[PDB]
Amino acid sequence: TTIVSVRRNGHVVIAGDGQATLGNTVMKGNVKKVRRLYNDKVIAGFAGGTADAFTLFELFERKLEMHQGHLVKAAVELAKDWRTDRMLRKLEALLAVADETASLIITGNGDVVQPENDLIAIGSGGPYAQAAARALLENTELSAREIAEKALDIAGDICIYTNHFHTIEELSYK
Amino acid sequence: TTIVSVRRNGHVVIAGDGQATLGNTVMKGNVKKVRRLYNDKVIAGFAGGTADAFTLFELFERKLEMHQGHLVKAAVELAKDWRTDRMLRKLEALLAVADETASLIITGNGDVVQPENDLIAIGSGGPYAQAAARALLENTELSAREIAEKALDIAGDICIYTNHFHTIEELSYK
Amino acid sequence: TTIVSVRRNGHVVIAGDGQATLGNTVMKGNVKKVRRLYNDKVIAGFAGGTADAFTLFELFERKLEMHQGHLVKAAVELAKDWRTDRMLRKLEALLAVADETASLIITGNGDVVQPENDLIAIGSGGPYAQAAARALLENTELSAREIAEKALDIAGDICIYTNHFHTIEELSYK
Amino acid sequence: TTIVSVRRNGHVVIAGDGQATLGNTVMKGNVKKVRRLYNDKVIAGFAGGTADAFTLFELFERKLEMHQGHLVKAAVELAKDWRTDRMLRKLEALLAVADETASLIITGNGDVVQPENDLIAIGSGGPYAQAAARALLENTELSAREIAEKALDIAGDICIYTNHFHTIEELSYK
Amino acid sequence: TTIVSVRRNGHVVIAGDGQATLGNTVMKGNVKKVRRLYNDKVIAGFAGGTADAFTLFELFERKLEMHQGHLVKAAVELAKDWRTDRMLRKLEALLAVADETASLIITGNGDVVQPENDLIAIGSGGPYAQAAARALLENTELSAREIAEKALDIAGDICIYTNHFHTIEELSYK
Amino acid sequence: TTIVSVRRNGHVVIAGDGQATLGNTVMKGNVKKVRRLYNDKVIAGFAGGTADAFTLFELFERKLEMHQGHLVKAAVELAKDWRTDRMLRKLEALLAVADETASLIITGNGDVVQPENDLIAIGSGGPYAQAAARALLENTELSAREIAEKALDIAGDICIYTNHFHTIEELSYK
């Protein structure tokens, strides 16, 4: 799996592949790994179990109207419940979340990272996507969506656990 | 074990073999792995304990009673508790469930999955069946029942953990 | 250890060896691995810790007068408490239980198996006993007791963890 | 360590060495591993913590007060809690206990075991003692005390974890 | 990562690099690992989650409010809960903290440590910094700030997990 | 680390080294591993985490005024809470404790050992210290303090995890 996120001029996107792998075989190819949350004002992508993601995301929303939509402040709380709480603590997942103020990773280790340019690339194929996304975002006038897509595809060619089925959610704030 | 579900021409099936293995020897040869539910409206197959089933298949039934026959939802609510309820959590298995509406898999992880063409192939022999099923479904006019059958035989021929005892459960609707 | 159970014409038996092994040495040779339960109407054998067996069996009885002596229905419940409950869940054992309606295995995995002819063979020496029991039950007019005994002895000759001390409980219902 | 209990001619003993080992070196050389209980009526030996003992040997005493000297039962009740009580459960050890009635071993597993001839040999040097004990007991008129002694010496000679410091506790009755 | 704290001529510092690594690749290159606390009186650096910090650095602040600026004690009380409070326990990190009084490290183990000369070097690059720091401090008149800096550069040159992005926090008092 | 304790003519001592090791590097060299407890009437040394030691010792004191200063009786209780209790049970440490009645080890395994002559030597370097302490205490008229020191130094020369920084607490009762 590979979740990619690029952000250029009032345009921020999140693109994932759709492969689910079991051992050495593909169990499903059209997994939806990117969805919208919080009255569509927030986009998200996730590496891992769909149900775990569903759980973690719902709670995320919960923390949003709970902090007037402030991503980070609402996000850090989630970084909390995640490591502290009994049940959640069991969940296995990597969250990529973005709105118009910033993009950022969220993990069960109570870590809330926000890469150098809101450039997020997580999942087994993450690095390869980053590598390509970096190249594109620094030698072309291409758009977030264009980079994310092109990057994700490069990731899919390199990473044995990433296919070419995509799901992209965009957010225009310009 | 191999569970194969197919759907063609207002007909949906679920087939399975009856081998239970302990180490390198066969414990039983006629395990019924495909039952029926919701007043014989909903069919299902599975891989796991004979009891785990009888507990996960009873609960499922009631969930349908709490969601007027609407498969998916009851399924959604099922996979829910199954990863939440302290007790229910230890249960390990893979429920294959199909109604005239749709058909899907459920994992202790709480995931609810609808495979490419309502084609389901879970179990160690899963992929060999998927392969044979996919072949037939794309190159012949055979019926959903004929498919799962032959797919299952192919499986038991390749899979050392799958035999040739079957248990087929159909469903007509159009 | 080896627990064997054969059932012919109104005669059902359960026979175990009596070896207890610690590492590579015999700690005890006359372990009683088969006993009667529920006003002698039910016979049982077990692979594992005697105290764990004692515990699991008592509870089994409990579930019996709790379900008018219905083996299975009362047995499946035990298959429950066993995996769900905290303490019990810790117990390590394999149960073989029979009355006049059916013979069947019970394990901590919430599994309640009932082999092809009520032919039960569990424990490290289990397969070898099954092998012999199968041969005898299909090429001779011998009785349950005769087969069980002869089988168990074959098991003891093959299996390094099964000795030749026996304990047989019989049940005649003819 | 080696605990050897023998019983011959209205005489029962329990003997033990006094070596405690940490890795490949001797920590102590005179550990008292054979005490006395129930108003000096019941003898006992053991392998484990000096405290685990003092807790499992105090409890045992009271159990006798709750079962009028009847060894076995108190023992049965002891091994009971010892595998049930949350706290008591962590205690690890092997109690050798003998009264004018009988003599038996007890394991954290809750097991109560009466070996072939009230002959007990627990501990890493256990079997070497059993061997020498069994030899003497079957080919000489030596006394129960003389047995355990010599058996113990043989043990400490073979066992790298057993020394030659003894602690013998007899009991006459006829 | 490398955290280097030094103290010379009424001047105390804490410096750190900004590399976060996941496997064999760099996730982020500018992680702020040296903040400030207690109404900008107390400086601190750290190795761990961006949140773990924000929780362990907030708590610390209040502890100071509960112990009138007296570093040590608040630190003592901090390391206390950090190994006692069920939740707080999962937090993993290494707090470097220094005030005009003294400077010390804190580990989830509850330890409060004051190194030889208020010289602190935690993190995978820790010892390479200690080495360079110790050298300079003993053979040159350079300032505490100049020390930590150069020590840090040396570190990032040796340490594959340490880079050259810095975050220095000083403190004057005399 | 090495904790040594010798006892000669109304003089009993406890000496530790002061090295703290992380992997293959020295994190701290002047660790205080020996301190006084219970109105200075009791001396102690510990192998392991300082905070864990602090915890275990405080409780020890607690058990002292709780049993009129009887070392053993108050010590055995600690041997209890240590293995039984949830939190404490997590602590990793080795306690060496002495007063004027006896010296003795205390561990999380509910073990309370009192070596042959109140000669205690615990920690990775423990044996080497014992070896030397034994030699000295049996071929010279040297004092506890002299032996403990000389022994500890020998330990430090042999044991890669023991340095030459000492901390000795003495107790004269003559």
Helices (H), chain A: 50-64, 71-84, 126-137, 144-158
A14 DSSP β-pair partners: A169
Compare all CA atoms of chain A with the CA of B79 and give the residue at the minimum distance: A51
How close, in Å, is residue E18 to chain A by CA atoms? 12
Q: Reduced to 3 states, what is the DSSP secondary structure of residue D79?
A: helix
Contact call for B28 and C83, based on CB within 8 A: no
Cβ–Cβ under 8 Å, residues B71 and B64: yes
In the sheet where F34-37 sits, what is the strand order? F34-37, F42-48, F93-98, F103-107
Altogether, the residues listed in chain C come to a count of 174
Catalytic residue among A1, A2, A107, A167: A1
Altogether, the residues listed in chain E come to a count of 174
- Phi-psi group of D23: left, alpha or beta (phi > 0 → left; psi -120 to 50 → alpha; rest → beta): left
- Residue B62 has which token pair? 């009631």
Identify which of F129, F93, F100, F111 has the alpha carbon closest to the alpha carbon of residue F3. Answer: F129
Tokens 């239970």 identify what position? Answer: B20
Contact call for C51 and D127, based on CB within 8 A: no
Q: What is the DSSP string of A84-124?
A: HSTTGGG--EEEEEE-SS-EEEEETTTB----TTS-EEEST
Q: Tell me the backbone φ, ψ of residue B74, rounded to 5 degrees.
A: -55, -40
CA angle B150/B152/B157 to nearest 5° reads: 95
- Residue C32 has which token pair? 């009683």
B64: amino acid identity, one letter: L
Distance of alpha carbon A59 from the chain centroid: 16
Identify which of B24, B13, B16, B42 has the alpha carbon closest to the alpha carbon of residue B122. Answer: B16
Identify which of C93, C103, C121, C96 has the alpha carbon closest to the alpha carbon of residue C2. Answer: C121
Please give the Cα distance from D104 to D126 (Å, whole number).
Answer: 14
Please give the Cα distance from E119 to E4 (Å, whole number).
Answer: 8
Helix axes F50-64, F71-84, angle to 10 degrees: 130
Please give the Cα distance from E36 to E44 (Å, whole number).
Answer: 6
Altogether, the residues listed in chain F come to a count of 174
CA angle B154/B155/B161 to nearest 5° reads: 140
B114: amino acid identity, one letter: Q
Cβ–Cβ under 8 Å, residues A36 and A170: no
Cβ–Cβ under 8 Å, residues A20 and A26: yes
Cβ–Cβ under 8 Å, residues A6 and A12: yes
- Contact exists between B and A (3 or more beta carbon pairs < 8 Å): yes
Compare all CA atoms of chain F with the CA of E119 and give the residue at the minimum distance: F28
HEC profile for B90-156?
A: HCCEEEEEECCCCEEEEECCCCEECCCCCCEEECCCHHHHHHHHHHHHHHCCCCHHHHHHHHHHHHH
- Phi-psi group of B39: left, alpha or beta (phi > 0 → left; psi -120 to 50 → alpha; rest → beta): left
Distance of alpha carbon E17 from the chain centroid: 11
How, if at all, do strands C103-107 and C93-98 pair? antiparallel
Experimental method of this PDB entry: X-ray
Residue D1 belongs to a domain with what CATH number?
3.60.20.10
Q: How many separate helices (H) and strands (E) can be counted in chain B?
A: 4, 10
Counting the structural domains of chain F, the total is 1
User: What are the percentages of helix, strand and coil residues in chain E, rounded to 5?
Assistant: 35, 25, 35
Cα separations (Å) of D37 from A33, B115, D16, D142?
68, 69, 16, 26
Q: Reduced to 3 states, what is the DSSP secondary structure of residue C97?
A: strand
| Whole-number CA gyration radius for chain D | 15
Please give the Cα distance from C156 to A103 (Å, whole number).
Answer: 67
- Residue D2 annotated as lining a ligand binding site: no
Supply the residues of D annotated as catalytic: 1
CB B7: neighbour CB atoms within 10 A? 22
Binding residues of C: 156, 159, 162
C155: amino acid identity, one letter: A
Altogether, the residues listed in chain B come to a count of 174
Cβ–Cβ under 8 Å, residues B52 and C110: yes
Residues 6+ apart with CB under 8 A from A75: A60, A63, A97, A104, A106, A112
Resolution of this model in Å is 2.8
Count C/D contacts: CB-CB distance under 8 Å.
22
CB A90: neighbour CB atoms within 10 A? 11
Q: Reduced to 3 states, what is the DSSP secondary structure of residue C69?
A: coil
Q: Which residues of B touch C109 (CB under 8 A)?
A: 49, 52, 92
Please give the Cα distance from D3 to D162 (Å, whole number).
Answer: 10
Contact call for F28 and E115, based on CB within 8 A: yes
Contact call for C110 and B55, based on CB within 8 A: yes
Tokens 């209890």 identify what position? Answer: F80
- For chain F, the straight-line distance linking the first and the last C-alpha, in angstroms and rounded, comes to 30
Cα separations (Å) of D150 from C27, D29, D144?
21, 19, 10
Please give the Cα distance from F56 to F69 (Å, whole number).
Answer: 16
Identify which of E30, E42, E50, E137 has the alpha carbon closest to the alpha carbon of residue E92. Answer: E50
- For chain D, the straight-line distance linking the first and the last C-alpha, in angstroms and rounded, comes to 30
Please give the Cα distance from B132 to F46 (Å, whole number).
Answer: 67
Q: What is the DSSP string of F1-30?
A: --EEEEEETTEEEEEE---EEETTEEEES-
Residues 6+ apart with CB under 8 A from C112: B50, B51, C72, C75, C76, C79, C104, C105, C106
Helix axes B126-139, B144-158, angle to 10 degrees: 140
Give which of C84, C90, C158 to mutate to test B binding, by max B Cβ within 10 Å.
C84
Identify which of A83, A89, A114, A157 has the alpha carbon closest to the alpha carbon of residue A12. Answer: A114
Q: Tell me the backbone φ, ψ of residue B96, rounded to 5 degrees.
A: -110, 125
Containing domain of residue B139, as a range?
Answer: 1-174
Please give the Cα distance from C23 to C79 (Å, whole number).
Answer: 29
Cα separations (Å) of F43 from E123, F35, F37, F81, F166?
35, 6, 6, 21, 15
E107 DSSP β-pair partners: E94
Q: Tell me the backbone φ, ψ of residue E134, rounded to 5 degrees.
A: -55, -45
Residues 6+ apart with CB under 8 A from F144: F6, F7, F8, F11, F12, F13, F170
Please give the Cα distance from B9 to B146 (Å, whole number).
Answer: 12
How close, in Å, is residue F28 to chain E by CA atoms? 6
- For chain A, the straight-line distance linking the first and the last C-alpha, in angstroms and rounded, comes to 30
Please name the member of D79, D116, D127 whose beta carbon is closest to the beta carbon of C30. D116
- Residue C82 has which token pair? 């066993």
Q: With 0-12 CB in 10 A as exposed, 13-18 as middle and 19+ as buried, what is E114?
A: middle
Sign of the C-alpha dihedral, residues D149, D153, D154, D155? positive
- For chain B, the straight-line distance linking the first and the last C-alpha, in angstroms and rounded, comes to 30
Identify which of B86, B113, B60 has the alpha carbon closest to the alpha carbon of residue A22. Answer: B113
C24: amino acid identity, one letter: N
Cα separations (Å) of A140 from A155, B56, D24, D61?
19, 54, 68, 85
Residues 6+ apart with CB under 8 A from B29: B18, B19, B163, B165, C116
Binding residues of A for Na(+): 156, 159, 162
F65: amino acid identity, one letter: E
C16 DSSP β-pair partners: C3, C167
Neighbours of chain D (3+ CB pairs under 8 A): C, F
- Which run of H or of E encompasses F134? helix F126-137
Residues 6+ apart with CB under 8 A from B40: none
A92: amino acid identity, one letter: E
Altogether, the residues listed in chain A come to a count of 174
Distance of alpha carbon F129 from the chain centroid: 12
Counting Cα atoms < 13 Å in the Cβ hemisphere of B51 gives 26
Cβ–Cβ under 8 Å, residues F130 and F141: no
**Which DSSP symbol is given to B88?**
G
Please name the member of A25, A28, A51 whose beta carbon is closest to the beta carbon of B110. A51
Compare all CA atoms of chain D with the CA of C28 and give the residue at the minimum distance: D115
- Residue A14 has which token pair? 């999140």
Please give the Cα distance from D96 to D105 (Å, whole number).
Answer: 5
